[PDB]
DNA sequence: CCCATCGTAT
DNA sequence: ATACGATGGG
């Protein structure tokens, strides 16, 4: 047996389609192609795969062989090798195992993986039918969605077919939903058209669980054939060039929004901080008020009529809703669709009617209403000391960033100064924004209307619930009083979302691009948890050995890597990288990162600055005593030295790590061989040296004094490859009497990984 | 031109 | 399993 796909992606796309509902299947190979068939765990969902000869680039099957294998294992081997490589299945007349063989256009890379076959009882039932009461084909896209959606309402979906009508229906405890589509043919984009041939209407019901499995076949085809019958199992078929994948399954007040996205955005700001709320509807619009569990955060929404494309009310109605169930319905289908809220005189439930831009596509849902009491709420006239407004996206960042440090955030308002502060166990953090009016980008202006200084503390828990409404307005209004609740408002067109909140009672090294130091720390934060940052007049260096003592990480950042550098006195900054990460994530990758430390260091200062903005985010990490490591100065001669793209070396490692906990590197003349041999099967990657003038960063240099054959723990190599963010290339020095060297050369710096072979 | 969906990679 | 990128459709 020898069958090669032109594109390895194809075979991956096939396996992925049915790999989640079957653990073990048999592939019966014949002269006329490959075929497979299996059932799910419950044994009601039958899957059948047929791959004809014309589906391959080359197919040769000496003798009918049956290949039983575990899809989990196979799919792991299918993740390997670029999806543009030529995949080739090879099996002997009596196979102990099957051999997969990847090969790109060039001869540079050659991947050969082997999987161990199994003994399965396979009787391929080759059976389809001639007559289905109805037959239809729709984009597997639209279908996958329809199913994923109605699966939130019920455990059983229902398909109902009539002439020129396809109706999917679901009924559950929270509510019901029905999607009606009609047959149409698109001349310009046929891949979106809907075919329907009805010999006779059908009203079959199918378990949602199985449909959820079936829709995974969308990875093979842009379309999905469905054949229904009141006497036969339904046929869900995904066609592929010269073949197909089949799933056989046996049946069992009106307020209209121009954009549906608005209502979603509103509910999003509501949920997560409030459970259920009464939507009070009147002729002048809709209002809703809810408090959080602890009753310290009040949410006040007011939607004016002008916010609707069309709005009408005969009489005031109150709709009690569970925002969780509500958001489930709001999930689908399109954000741009026309949303409409219908309700009868004595509302037992509310009906949401989604309508696409296309006249054809329709979807309506019905949410069962709750019973909630409104009383009692009273808002005394509130006077505020300070009043500011700023880009919601900016305020959102500040909150999210500072939330990382403390469970409490402090807002301080002084004359022409707004200071956000958070103080936690690892260290503090303060962002200081300055009021300014900008003619260009006037939306990003920071207004301040202060009558008297204010110092208020809030639980980060609640500020994170407030920033949820940032999707409603470019800006956010903040009224702050010392005796009144803090008010956070998001302005809608003809409306608003308000949040009432109750207070609480409690060395100079400037990086050109902050992102640089961030990707550096990410390069070895997984290898070592605690590390000293020794700072000298010539730059920053760090040596660290993990607890296992097998890996040595050597960092070095030269002065030429900074936009500015000063060192009056050699300082050492012992830091917890896990802490340093949280802080490095806050500031922008483009912002200027300045490290500041006093002569007698107790803490380090990380300073994030903007280009033309007064905005300054200063952070502070608490240092800790880390005992330095014992340095071994080894000057030796390696057996072999190779350099390759760190992007390639990374893929190679991640691919083989799936097979074994050990990866063997074996250098021979003009050949580099990476081999992982695990239980499920052994995979092997073989690269060859070559130079490419046009693109030098794709070359592979290989100098060898003597063949090498070392094994490294995949656990460690997975950490070493994370330096691929620092350099396009990775240096590899290998020796039999010495630890391997993995080097990533930065600009005016480097990151060395000295790993010890097993 | 913008938005949504699907596929691929990490 | 999640995130990012690319392609297709509206």
Numbering used by the authors: 2 to 253, 269 to 522, 536 to 787
In the authors' words:
The faithful and efficient copying of chromosomal DNA is performed by chromosomal replicases, which generate double-stranded DNA from primed, single-stranded DNA. These replicases achieve great speed and processivity by tethering to ring-shaped protein complexes called sliding clamps, which encircle DNA and have the ability to slide freely along the DNA strand. The sliding clamps share a domain architecture that has a six-fold pseudosymmetric rotation axis running through the center of the clamp and a central pore lined with α-helices through which DNA is threaded. The central hole within the sliding clamp is lined with α-helices that present a number of conserved, positively charged residues, creating a surface that complements the negatively charged DNA backbone.
In an attempt to crystallographically trap an open clamp, the single-chain PCNA contained mutations R110S and Y114S in the first subunit. The PCNA in the model is very well resolved and, despite these mutations, is closed and does not significantly deviate from wild-type PCNA. We used one of these datasets for the analysis presented here, derived from a crystal that incorporated a 10-base pair DNA construct with a four-base 5' overhang on one end. Based on this weak density, we placed a 10-base pair B-form DNA in the center of the PCNA ring at a tilt of ~40° with respect to the rotation axis of PCNA. Refinement of coordinates and temperature (B) factors for individual atoms in this PCNA-DNA model resulted in very high temperature factors for the atoms in the DNA (in the range of about 125-450 Å2). This indicates that the DNA is partially disordered or has low occupancy, and the resolution of the dataset does not permit reliable refinement of individual atomic positions for the DNA. Inspection of the position of the partially disordered DNA in our model reveals potential interactions between DNA and the center of PCNA.
